[PDB]
Design a protein around this ligand. Structure first.
Ligand SMILES: O=C(O)CCCC(=O)OC[C@@H](NC(=O)C(Cl)Cl)[C@H](OP(=O)(O)Cc1ccc(NC(=O)C(F)(F)F)cc1)c1ccc([N+](=O)[O-])cc1
Lengths: 220, 219
C-alpha cells in the first residue's frame, strides 16, 4: 500500500533545531502535494506546512512561519521539515501526509515525536506490581508494571514479549516535574501465575534501554 | 480568526444507532472557486487520523457507505447511520477553503454499552521502589462503563487529595469499557508513618463505594 514513514523526532532543547524526514513509497511521490500535520500532547490537530509537487510553492501555519522550512527530494522520495528556534508549543507528534489537492489528506504516516524541553533524557525505573499475601484473588490475578521517572516519551510496554495481549491495559503517561510515569495492568488465570512467568517488557528508545521485569510473588 | 467549532465534545451512541456530529465555522467555507473544501477525519485509538469525507459530502475510497457528510456555508454535519464498535475514536472536521487551513477541536464517539462496574485492584509500593526511597501506591479500576468515576484515597482515614494522579485508557473496541489507574505518590518516609491505605471508587453502578484496602504491616 502507499506508505509514509517519518524519522528524526526526539528531544531538543528550547531554541534548538531539528530536521524531520518522511520516506514515501508505493506511489509516484513527485506527482503529489505533500503536508506536515502535528498533534499536540492534548490531542489538538494543527496543520504545519505544505509543499507543492515540484517544491516551488510552500505554505506554513502562522506560528511556524520563518522558523520552519518544508522541502522535498523528488529523486529519492523524501519529504523534509527543517525546524529552528524550537519552543514548547512545538512539542507534538508530527505526521507527514499525502495531499490529493482538494480531495484531502489521503495517506498518513505513523508520526514521529518531537519534545522541546531543557530536561535530560532519563531511562525508566520499572517496578513490579504483585498482589498481597492470600488476597491474590485466586482464580484471576491482576498484575502490573509501574514505569516511573523517564523522559522523553515514548515507552513501549508488552507482556511476555507480546505473547500476552489479552486482558492488558497500558495507561497513558502523565508528565510531572520533567518525568513521565505510566502503569500497565494484566489479568491472567491463577493456573498461569506465579507457576508460569509473567514479565513486562519496557522499551525506552530515547535512552536505548529495554528492561524485562518479572513479576514474582511477594516475600510473605 | 477562522474558528472551526465542533459539538459535542463527546457523543455516546449504541451500536446500531445513528450518530450526528456538527462542525460550525466562524466564516463561510465557500472557496473562490465556488466549491467548499470541508473534510472529515477519524482518529482511532493509537492510530493516525484517516480521511472519511472531502468536499463536504464525498466519501474517500474504501470508506463504508454508512458515513455521510452534509451542510453548507458555515454549518456541516457528519452522520454515521448504523454505528459499529470500530467507529469509536475522535472525529475532526477540517477546512482548506481559506488560509490558514484549520481543524475542528474534535468530537469523541463513545459506544454506549450496558453499565459495568470496575474491578478494583490495589498495590502497595514494591520493595525495590522503597529501596530507592520513593513510594507509589497503585489502584487499577478495570473494565467499567460509563467513563465518569471518582476515586478517593484515604490514609489512616484522612482523605488524601494531594499526590493522586488518575489516567484512563481510551475505550476498548473489544468490549466498549474503560479502565483507569489511580496512583498515590508519597515520599518513603511519609508512606512509612501510616498503616491503612484505601482507594475508594464511586461509580453510578452502585450506591456503595467499591473499596480496596491494605495494611502496610500485613502480607
Ligand atoms: O501556485 C500557483 O499555481 C500560483 C498560486 C495560485 C494558484 O493557482 O495555485 C494556488 C494553489 N496552489 C497550488 O496548487 C500549489 Cl500546491 Cl502549486 C493553492 O494555494 P493558495 O490558494 O494560494 C493558498 C493555500 C495554501 C494551503 C492550502 N491548503 C493546504 O496546504 C492543506 F492544508 F490543505 F494541505 C490551500 C490554499 C493551494 C491549493 C491546494 C493546496 N493543497 O494543499 O491541497 C495547497 C495550495
Amino acid at each position: 500500500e502507499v506508505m509514509l514513514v517519518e524519522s528524526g523526532g526526539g528531544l531538543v532543547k528550547p531554541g534548538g533545531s531539528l530536521k524531520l524526514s518522511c520516506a514515501a513509497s508505493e506511489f509516484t511521490f513527485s506527482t503529489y502535494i505533500m503536508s506536515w500535520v502535528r498533534q499536540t500532547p492534548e490531542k489538538r490537530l494543527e496543520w504545519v506546512a505544505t509543499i507543492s509537487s515540484s517544491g516551488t510553492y510552500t505554505y506554513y501555519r502562522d506560528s511556524v512561519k520563518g522558523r520552519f522550512t518544508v522541502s522535498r527530494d523528488n529523486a529519492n522520495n523524501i519529504l523534509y521539515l527543517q525546524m529552528s528556534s524550537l519552543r514548547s508549543e512545538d512539542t507534538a507528534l508530527y505526521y507527514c501526509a499525502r495531499r490529493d489537492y482538494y480531495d484531502g489528506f489521503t495517506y498518513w504516516g505513523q508520526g514521529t515525536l518531537v519534545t522541546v524541553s531543557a530536561a535530560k533524557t532519563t531511562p525508566p525505573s520499572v517496578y513490579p506490581l504483585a498482589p498481597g499475601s492470600a488476597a491474590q484473588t485466586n482464580s484471576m490475578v491482576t498484575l502490573g508494571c509501574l514505569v516511573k521517572g523517564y523522559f522523553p516519551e515514548p515507552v513501549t510496554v508488552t507482556w511476555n514479549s507480546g505473547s500476552l495481549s489479552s486482558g492488558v491495559h497500558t495507561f497513558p503517561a502523565v508528565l510531572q516535574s520533567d518525568l513521565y510515569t505510566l502503569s500497565s495492568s494484566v489479568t491472567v488465570p491463577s493456573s498461569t501465575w506465579p507457576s508460569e512467568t509473567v514479565t513486562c517488557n519496557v522499551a525506552h528508545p530515547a535512552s536505548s534501554t529495554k528492561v524485562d521485569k518479572k513479576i514474582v510473588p511477594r516475600d510473605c | 480568526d477562522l474558528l472551526m467549532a465542533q459539538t459535542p465534545l463527546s457523543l455516546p451512541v449504541s451500536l446500531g444507532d445513528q450518530a450526528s456530529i456538527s462542525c460550525r465555522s466562524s466564516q463561510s467555507l465557500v472557496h473562490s472557486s465556488g466549491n467548499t473544501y470541508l473534510e472529515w477525519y477519524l482518529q482511532k485509538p493509537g492510530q493516525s487520523p484517516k480521511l472519511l469525507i472531502y468536499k463536504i459530502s464525498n466519501r474517500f475510497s474504501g470508506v463504508p457507505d454508512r458515513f455521510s457528510g452534509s451542510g453548507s456555508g458555515t454549518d456541516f454535519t457528519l452522520k454515521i447511520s448504523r454505528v459499529e464498535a470500530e467507529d469509536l475514536g475522535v472525529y475532526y472536521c477540517f477546512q482548506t477553503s481559506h488560509v490558514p487551513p484549520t481543524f475542528g477541536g474534535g468530537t469523541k464517539l463513545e459506544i454506549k454499552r450496558a453499565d459495568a462496574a470496575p474491578t478494583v485492584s490495589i498495590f502497595p509500593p514494591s520493595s525495590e521502589q522503597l529501596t530507592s526511597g520513593g513510594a507509589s501506591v497503585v489502584c487499577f479500576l478495570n473494565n467499567f462503563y460509563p467513563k465518569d468515576i471518582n476515586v478517593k484515597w484515604k490514609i489512616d482515614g484522612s482523605e488524601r487529595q494531594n499526590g493522586v494522579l488518575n489516567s484512563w485508557t481510551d475505550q476498548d473496541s473489544k468490549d466498549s469499557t474503560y479502565s483507569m489507574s489511580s496512583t498515590l505518590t508519597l515520599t518513603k518516609d511519609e508512606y512509612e508513618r501510616h498503616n491503612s491505605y484505601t482507594c475508594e471508587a464511586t461509580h453510578k453502578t452502585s450506591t456503595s463505594p467499591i473499596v480496596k484496602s491494605f495494611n502496610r504491616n500485613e502480607c
